[PDB]
């Protein structure tokens, strides 16, 4: 149910279809172990919260969105409503991530 971003202008029409739904953007790398382990945990969640968008960008793919983005950590989670950044963390921490969606949803 995660939404797989190819292009810049495909992550900001992604942010702008949204509507007043929190989206939630899960920023990986290949060489990255975590990102890839909860790779599954995310998908869980996307099936899940099925009143949530879930976004995944790679940042090898997706350097420019990466770099504005302002992405430091693999993996990293920004969350946004209405186009704007109402919260962000690193680090694969799957209990975190759902009471962070939890709380903004």
Do not use: R
């Not at 797989?4 to 992604?14: D, N, R």
């Not at 680090?91 to 969606?101: C, H, R, V, Y």
Request: glycine share 4%; hydrophobic share 40%.
């Amino acid at each position: 149910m995660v939404k797989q971003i190819e292009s810049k202008t495909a992550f900001q029409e992604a942010l702008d279809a949204a509507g007043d739904k929190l989206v939630v953007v899960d920023f990986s790398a290949t060489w990255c172990g975590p990102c890839k382990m909860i790779k599954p945990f995310f998908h869980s969640l996307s099936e899940k919260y099925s009143n949530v968008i879930f976004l995944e960008v790679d940042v090898d793919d997706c350097q420019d969105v990466a770099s504005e983005c302002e992405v430091k950590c693999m993996p990293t989670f920004q969350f946004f409503k209405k186009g704007q950044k109402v919260g962000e963390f690193s680090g694969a921490n799957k209990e975190k991530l759902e009471a962070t969606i939890n709380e903004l949803v």
